[PDB]
Design a protein around this ligand. Sequence first.
Ligand SMILES: *[C@@H]1O[C@H](CO[C@@H]2O[C@@H](C)[C@@H](O)[C@@H](O)[C@@H]2O)[C@@H](O[C@@H]2O[C@H](CO)[C@@H](O[C@@H]3O[C@H](CO[C@H]4O[C@H](CO)[C@@H](O)[C@H](O)[C@@H]4O)[C@@H](O)[C@H](O[C@H]4O[C@H](CO)[C@@H](O)[C@H](O)[C@@H]4O)[C@@H]3O)[C@H](O)[C@H]2NC(C)=O)[C@H](O)[C@H]1NC(C)=O
Ligand SMILES: *[C@@H]1O[C@H](CO[C@@H]2O[C@@H](C)[C@@H](O)[C@@H](O)[C@@H]2O)[C@@H](O[C@@H]2O[C@H](CO)[C@@H](O[C@@H]3O[C@H](CO[C@H]4O[C@H](CO)[C@@H](O)[C@H](O)[C@@H]4O)[C@@H](O)[C@H](O[C@H]4O[C@H](CO)[C@@H](O)[C@H](O)[C@@H]4O)[C@@H]3O)[C@H](O)[C@H]2NC(C)=O)[C@H](O)[C@H]1NC(C)=O
Ligand SMILES: *[C@@H]1O[C@H](CO)[C@@H](O[C@@H]2O[C@H](CO)[C@@H](O[C@@H]3O[C@H](CO[C@H]4O[C@H](CO)[C@@H](O)[C@H](O)[C@@H]4O)[C@@H](O)[C@H](O)[C@@H]3O)[C@H](O)[C@H]2NC(C)=O)[C@H](O)[C@H]1NC(C)=O
Ligand SMILES: *[C@@H]1O[C@H](CO[C@@H]2O[C@@H](C)[C@@H](O)[C@@H](O)[C@@H]2O)[C@@H](O[C@@H]2O[C@H](CO)[C@@H](O)[C@H](O)[C@H]2NC(C)=O)[C@H](O)[C@H]1NC(C)=O
Ligand SMILES: *[C@@H]1O[C@H](CO)[C@@H](O[C@@H]2O[C@H](CO)[C@@H](O)[C@H](O)[C@H]2NC(C)=O)[C@H](O)[C@H]1NC(C)=O
Ligand SMILES: *[C@@H]1O[C@H](CO)[C@@H](O[C@@H]2O[C@H](CO)[C@@H](O)[C@H](O)[C@H]2NC(C)=O)[C@H](O)[C@H]1NC(C)=O
Ligand SMILES: *[C@@H]1O[C@H](CO)[C@@H](O[C@@H]2O[C@H](CO)[C@@H](O)[C@H](O)[C@H]2NC(C)=O)[C@H](O)[C@H]1NC(C)=O
Ligand SMILES: *[C@@H]1O[C@H](CO)[C@@H](O[C@@H]2O[C@H](CO)[C@@H](O)[C@H](O)[C@H]2NC(C)=O)[C@H](O)[C@H]1NC(C)=O
Ligand SMILES: *[C@@H]1O[C@H](CO)[C@@H](O[C@@H]2O[C@H](CO)[C@@H](O)[C@H](O)[C@H]2NC(C)=O)[C@H](O)[C@H]1NC(C)=O
Ligand SMILES: *[C@@H]1O[C@H](CO)[C@@H](O[C@@H]2O[C@H](CO)[C@@H](O)[C@H](O)[C@H]2NC(C)=O)[C@H](O)[C@H]1NC(C)=O
Ligand SMILES: *[C@@H]1O[C@H](CO)[C@@H](O)[C@H](O)[C@H]1NC(C)=O
Lengths: 218, 163, 163, 215, 214, 186, 219
Amino acid sequence: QVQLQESGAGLVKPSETLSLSCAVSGGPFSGAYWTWIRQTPGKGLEWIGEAGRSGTTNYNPSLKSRVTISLDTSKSQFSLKLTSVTAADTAVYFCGRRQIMSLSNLYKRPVDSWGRGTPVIVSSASTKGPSVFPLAPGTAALGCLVKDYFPEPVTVSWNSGALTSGVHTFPAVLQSSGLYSLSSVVTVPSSSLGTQTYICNVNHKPSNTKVDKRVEPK
Amino acid sequence: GTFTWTLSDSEGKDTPGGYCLTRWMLIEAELKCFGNTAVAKCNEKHDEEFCDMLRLFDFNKQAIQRLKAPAQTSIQLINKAVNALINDQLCMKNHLRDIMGIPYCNYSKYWYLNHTTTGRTSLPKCWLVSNGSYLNETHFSDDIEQQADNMITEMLQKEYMER
Amino acid sequence: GTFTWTLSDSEGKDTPGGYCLTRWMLIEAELKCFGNTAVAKCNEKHDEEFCDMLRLFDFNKQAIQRLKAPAQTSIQLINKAVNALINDQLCMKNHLRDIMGIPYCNYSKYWYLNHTTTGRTSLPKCWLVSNGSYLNETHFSDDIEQQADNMITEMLQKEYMER
Amino acid sequence: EIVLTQSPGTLSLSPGERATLSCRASQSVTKNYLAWYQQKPGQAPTLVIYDASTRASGIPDRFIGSGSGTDFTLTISRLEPEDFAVYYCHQYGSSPPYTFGRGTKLEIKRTVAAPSVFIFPPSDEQLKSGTASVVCLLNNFYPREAKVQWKVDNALQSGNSQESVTEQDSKDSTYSLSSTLTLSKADYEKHKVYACEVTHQGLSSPVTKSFNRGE
Amino acid sequence: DIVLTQSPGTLSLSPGERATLSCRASQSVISYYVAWYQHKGGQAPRLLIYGASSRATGVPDRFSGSGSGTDFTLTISSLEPEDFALYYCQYYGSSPLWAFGQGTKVEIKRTVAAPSVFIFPPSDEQLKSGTASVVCLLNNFYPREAKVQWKVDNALQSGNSQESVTEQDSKDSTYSLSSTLTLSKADYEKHKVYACEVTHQGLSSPVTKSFNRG
Amino acid sequence: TSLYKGVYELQTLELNMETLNMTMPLSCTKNNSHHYIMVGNETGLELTLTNTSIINHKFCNLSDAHKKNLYDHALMSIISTFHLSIPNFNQYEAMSCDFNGGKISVQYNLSHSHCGTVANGVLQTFMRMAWGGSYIALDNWDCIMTSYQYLIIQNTTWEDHCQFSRPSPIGYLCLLSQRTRDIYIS
Amino acid sequence: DEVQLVQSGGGLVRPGGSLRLSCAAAGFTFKSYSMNWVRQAPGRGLEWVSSITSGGSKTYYADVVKGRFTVSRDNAKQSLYLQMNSLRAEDTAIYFCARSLHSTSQPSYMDVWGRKITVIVSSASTKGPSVFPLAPSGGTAALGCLVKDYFPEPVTVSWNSGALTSGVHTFPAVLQSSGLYSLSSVVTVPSSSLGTQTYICNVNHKPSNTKVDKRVEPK
Ligand SMILES: *[C@@H]1O[C@H](CO[C@@H]2O[C@@H](C)[C@@H](O)[C@@H](O)[C@@H]2O)[C@@H](O[C@@H]2O[C@H](CO)[C@@H](O[C@@H]3O[C@H](CO[C@H]4O[C@H](CO)[C@@H](O)[C@H](O)[C@@H]4O)[C@@H](O)[C@H](O[C@H]4O[C@H](CO)[C@@H](O)[C@H](O)[C@@H]4O)[C@@H]3O)[C@H](O)[C@H]2NC(C)=O)[C@H](O)[C@H]1NC(C)=O
Ligand SMILES: *[C@@H]1O[C@H](CO[C@@H]2O[C@@H](C)[C@@H](O)[C@@H](O)[C@@H]2O)[C@@H](O[C@@H]2O[C@H](CO)[C@@H](O[C@@H]3O[C@H](CO[C@H]4O[C@H](CO)[C@@H](O)[C@H](O)[C@@H]4O)[C@@H](O)[C@H](O[C@H]4O[C@H](CO)[C@@H](O)[C@H](O)[C@@H]4O)[C@@H]3O)[C@H](O)[C@H]2NC(C)=O)[C@H](O)[C@H]1NC(C)=O
Ligand SMILES: *[C@@H]1O[C@H](CO)[C@@H](O[C@@H]2O[C@H](CO)[C@@H](O[C@@H]3O[C@H](CO[C@H]4O[C@H](CO)[C@@H](O)[C@H](O)[C@@H]4O)[C@@H](O)[C@H](O)[C@@H]3O)[C@H](O)[C@H]2NC(C)=O)[C@H](O)[C@H]1NC(C)=O
Ligand SMILES: *[C@@H]1O[C@H](CO[C@@H]2O[C@@H](C)[C@@H](O)[C@@H](O)[C@@H]2O)[C@@H](O[C@@H]2O[C@H](CO)[C@@H](O)[C@H](O)[C@H]2NC(C)=O)[C@H](O)[C@H]1NC(C)=O
Ligand SMILES: *[C@@H]1O[C@H](CO)[C@@H](O[C@@H]2O[C@H](CO)[C@@H](O)[C@H](O)[C@H]2NC(C)=O)[C@H](O)[C@H]1NC(C)=O
Ligand SMILES: *[C@@H]1O[C@H](CO)[C@@H](O[C@@H]2O[C@H](CO)[C@@H](O)[C@H](O)[C@H]2NC(C)=O)[C@H](O)[C@H]1NC(C)=O
Ligand SMILES: *[C@@H]1O[C@H](CO)[C@@H](O[C@@H]2O[C@H](CO)[C@@H](O)[C@H](O)[C@H]2NC(C)=O)[C@H](O)[C@H]1NC(C)=O
Ligand SMILES: *[C@@H]1O[C@H](CO)[C@@H](O[C@@H]2O[C@H](CO)[C@@H](O)[C@H](O)[C@H]2NC(C)=O)[C@H](O)[C@H]1NC(C)=O
Ligand SMILES: *[C@@H]1O[C@H](CO)[C@@H](O[C@@H]2O[C@H](CO)[C@@H](O)[C@H](O)[C@H]2NC(C)=O)[C@H](O)[C@H]1NC(C)=O
Ligand SMILES: *[C@@H]1O[C@H](CO)[C@@H](O[C@@H]2O[C@H](CO)[C@@H](O)[C@H](O)[C@H]2NC(C)=O)[C@H](O)[C@H]1NC(C)=O
Ligand SMILES: *[C@@H]1O[C@H](CO)[C@@H](O)[C@H](O)[C@H]1NC(C)=O
């Protein structure tokens, strides 16, 4: 019944400090080890640390005493602070609630309730909005190319949500430039090519840039 | 005043009596069943800590099962019943010994003898402590010896009466 | 609650147990040693005044030797320990008897039988009083008689088990 | 750390079959404090097994935890569609730090499906800005493995492409792939025939779709 | 005399749900002498709860007991496959010395399955002997409640037919039932058309299977 | 394993006193300074030996706290059992309390100064109630001293406080007889 | 040993006859416990029959069996007896022995039970069954065997000498007004196999030394 919601700056320039927070709701802020866990796509899941209201706090040695997990019982929110941030500290960061089962930890239970996760990126790159270039065309196919943007996310829909069949929106990529690139496509019948109109609706909220481009069937 | 809580645990056993400490009542150990001849001494002895604990755990088991749980934990019941479960002068004895530097019982650890083929068990006796250091077995070895003797005497009294 | 203080005085004796009242503990008399069979009854009986006094003098001896003396005499310790040493209902009994004109025990004078060649001794029993007048021996002569009988029964139980 | 090695990396089965997932521990796991998590993509992990063998709340009888010491196993019998995800191995009985496995992805095995290939020339608008992006789409193919080879004027390209794969679709269990060739406007206009050659199981011979600048 | 009335007579639940079995007594009784028993067919009754709330050794903790005065409860928290059997409450001390309940059966709740009806004419060997048994079979249905009506020459028959039901199938939880109409050879050849009419809540309309002699 | 008389093997058992958590209090020691007596699975009581005060006034408005009746009834019993077991308590200004909103906040000023110290009485009671692992809190006819200046008793949350000694009920149950014993008339 | 009660006795008697049920204890102090007899008549529930205190001082009987049944024990032999005399047809049931202990220290309960003892009270003579076919008349068809007019129970019906088990339902037997039992065993099979495959029911009635095999065929 407990609900954990995490928040904080997902953008950190290198050699700075990441600061995140976890709001606990729907349950007492007690009787548990409040846990931070991050998930990198390449290296998997890494346990960051634990802070219990009993006073015990243990961290991952790999974090080399640059991590701090504070409790703040009044606001019912524990926090994560990671200093001297590097490129490798980029990951999805998760909230945790490890229920405590014994006054002496005679019995233990693993983390059972996790937050939604906040993507965190570490880069010197600045915020830039996307450039939406189209994809020019039985059953033929078409799409849009969302190039050079920072940071993620970007959303894209087709015909203002009316078109949902046959549409695929690929995950973003990272160029050496540090900017992201996406492609979104959809398969349509060739008889309906000239009759029905198609338009992709891209929105990159972190730059409040909203570019809608139509099909260009040259 | 003098303790009175009787232990009730005869169901499904080979003969009425005894008491089985379930896994929940033991630190990192499986169930341990003690026979009638050992446990029946708890009805008479006035100075066996383990007997006071048997009544304590049985009262807790009974009270939880036969009374409905309150919203907020009340300790009224245990305050009302403590002297029918334990001998408050027994732990006064352990307190006075502690005050005096004499090894004493903190009620947590007990030892008993267990026959290697018949499984017969002695009534567990408290493993004593002093300033955080528990006695070594050598410190009370002759006690363990006379306990083995009483076990042998009882085993011979049983073979005689089993005619 | 029920008394629990154990008597420890086995050093240098022919067999563990018993208790010796030193000269300091006796009014105008030399040391008096009582054997295990008599003193061991103090672990079980709930109504022997002399047993309560044995625990009282032993606690005083132990406390003085094992605790450092305060500057000003405190009675905190005895208030904490009294019920592990004596049976406060035993002297309630003696009080109620006094109130009623029945001979009672003022805990000061005791009698015992002493075998004229083997030295074996009975557990001392309190010499009763009433309105400042102590009972004459004639008043409880048949008690002394049955005590001699229990001594003879015990001496015969010993010769049997000494085989 | 107690490193948890999970095998296999990917396990491809179809609904109704049995999935046997393995987790080996470097050191013995204390008090069998071994847990299993199920993570569906974009979602957070979900507890399904604790104490090596005990099921969590709402976990059907299909899931069976089995193990002790260093040898642990999660078996999902009578596989339902909802059970396909990446399952993780977690130990919580050690001293800091608690560790996780690298994961076992459970994907649906369908019949083989060849990709439908499409080639997209750069937009005239993109050409105005001075960098060209040719894109190749591989649509609705199983299994996930597929090579794309970029060829301009029949020259094999390396270090100028980046591909990106969609997750297994819910209705058909088919992946899709997009590979983008990014070249400078200068090199784009130098050459003429831009080729995307796709090698995949469903294709008897690799298919190639192409365009010529100014078609 | 004391009377222990359990309720419901049949408790139909799926695996994994709370089962609440009830026992009501004629008079008010002392909880210490109320006991619950499980009874599977192939074995002897099994003591589950004694003293109203004490759980016997070997009982797997999902079983619980509670109650006072005249109303007593046996509860299974998460019904498991082996938990589907008969259950009896018990009181010791009144008249009868040991009183029992009539029993509650917990069964597996299933989707409603309609019976597949078959009618069987009497064999000729049976006629050569002088009695005729026509059998009507209701196969693989749920729930167990089914009505079989024997009609001969379109005449309702009562008193000449015994029924028998199988126990719930361990795989698909269905029931099967057979009705045997037993008539003398004389009365068998008096009438021509023989029909059993089945009404079950899985059928769209009451199903009738018939035959004509020859 | 140890074999006596050839056939009797010496064996041990350790009671898990936390099974009693729903019927009686459980004491335990976290470290030298922090000690706990817990009640149930939700609330409890932290006993602190500290140089850092938390109450600068000299009031203990129990009459007010009782009338308002916001505090945990079990915790108040324990507080009463603790204070009523202090031998020869006579410096009511050495005891300060705050019960606002129903909380439990009790502070004994041990620095009010050997056997006639109010700290003696307080520490003896603290010794008896945290009996399990109180020996690491401090180091004379039962009379005790400490360099710490305050004993603080505050309600706390149910957490894994028992990090040095395992929970036990003996300290509390054996204190119950010391109530209203060696108490002065006023 | 294990704590158990080993049943003995039982069988078949005519009305008015007698039967002695016995039950010997194993691995528990028999003399400490009261002893009980409980029966279950077919189609009905558990029903208490009689009980005897630990030392035999007291015996109690259900009103239905008073004056006909006599319970007794032999603590030296650690044995329990039920002498059922003047038996009635309604006394047909399975019977169980069970221990209990009646003291203020324990609740009342029957913890240790013996296995079932079968008691049949009938005037019928043992008689093998007469097996008549149930012939089938697209999809699936049903055929079976009618095992009629046999006594006592049980009978064991198998199909195609054990090889055919899927979809077989052998129904519980009904006690006809004659005093004899009757049952049907059915099996559903694919209609296509009616011509290719032969279908035999094998009815074994061990009490009458009867083994009957019957071909079921269409029409
Ligand atoms: C102990 O055993 C008792 C029976 O044992 C017999 O008697 C003892 C003294 C010995 O001689 C022994 O050797 C015998 O075998 C048993 O007695 C039962 O007690 C209950 C009361 O607790 C009675 O129930 C109440 O009965 C009254 C009287 O009407 C009844 O009359 C006949 C018996 O003559 C019954 O068979 C009827 O069915 C009637 O029920 C009723 O008035 C009452 O119902 C209403 O009244 C109460 C309040 O008075 C309301 O609360 C109810 O809801 C109703 O509105 C009860 O039904 C029971 O009849 C009686 N049986 C016999 C045979 O005497 C006793 O229960 C045992 N004790 C324990 C603790 O088990
Ligand atoms: C515990 O209770 C103490 C007494 O409580 C009062 O009496 C009991 C029986 C209950 O009815 C209870 O509800 C009552 O409150 C309590 O001490 C009291 O604290 C208040 C402050 O909140 C004091 O009020 C202040 O009074 C002074 C003047 O009075 C003093 O001086 C005169 C003359 O010397 C004496 O006769 C009095 O006894 C006092 O010694 C005012 O100057 C002051 O005005 C300003 O103070 C506050 C400070 O923040 C401002 O916010 C206000 O706005 C004012 O502008 C207060 O009016 C009260 O005198 C005092 N009583 C005593 C006997 O000391 C204590 O606080 C309680 N503790 C807890 C933890 O609850
Ligand atoms: C505080 O006191 C409470 C009352 O004494 C304690 O409650 C007890 O807690 C345990 C769990 O910690 C409950 O255990 C029950 O067991 C089932 C399944 O257990 C299975 O395993 C055992 C062998 O270990 C086996 O014998 C069983 O048959 C089972 O198959 C659990 O799933 C349930 O949680 C269930 O409740 C006790 O029943 C429970 N007792 C009561 C009366 O509630 C509580 O643990 C104490 N707190 C602490 C921290 O010790
Ligand atoms: C603390 O425990 C209470 C009570 O738990 C119940 O009683 C115990 C003795 C034991 O038998 C538990 O298994 C019981 O659940 C909790 O209050 C109950 O919580 C359960 C769910 O855990 C809920 O179903 C009940 O409705 C609650 N109320 C009751 C039983 O009256 C309470 O939530 C626990 N507190 C914490 C912080 O964990
Ligand atoms: C005993 O353990 C507790 C809990 O970790 C310690 O309490 C902390 O003490 C520091 C400094 O005194 C405070 O800043 C923290 O706020 C305290 N934490 C809590 C939860 O109260 C205490 O210091 C330890 N005592 C000793 C002697 O090590
Ligand atoms: C005494 O020792 C014996 C053997 O060491 C213990 O018996 C074990 O426990 C089970 C059931 O509790 C017995 O059936 C087996 O004989 C033993 N099982 C093993 C060794 O795995 C007995 O439990 C001991 N008694 C006590 C009180 O500790
Ligand atoms: C019982 O009587 C005997 C003899 O009357 C007492 O023995 C005397 O005491 C010393 C040592 O205590 C013995 O060695 C001698 O045999 C006796 N010495 C004498 C008489 O001078 C014995 O002490 C008496 N016991 C008690 C308890 O009074
Ligand atoms: C606890 O008691 C001590 C001693 O009574 C108080 O210490 C005195 O405090 C004030 C100034 O701080 C003066 O009366 C003295 O200078 C202090 N004496 C000593 C020996 O320290 C202390 O203030 C009290 N603490 C609280 C919170 O009331
Ligand atoms: C709490 O304060 C007391 C104040 O007396 C400290 O005790 C003194 O400590 C100094 C230096 O450590 C010694 O020179 C004094 O002799 C001590 N006074 C005594 C023992 O009465 C005490 O160390 C402090 N405790 C903590 C944990 O900080
Ligand atoms: C000590 O107890 C108080 C009173 O219960 C706690 O404060 C209250 O906590 C509840 C929830 O537990 C809240 O609903 C109230 O609003 C709080 N009231 C006040 C005045 O704070 C307090 O949190 C407890 N302290 C500890 C450390 O557990
Ligand atoms: C106790 O007796 C009263 C009065 O006959 C009755 O109402 C109640 O149900 C009985 N049982 C209880 C209180 O458990």
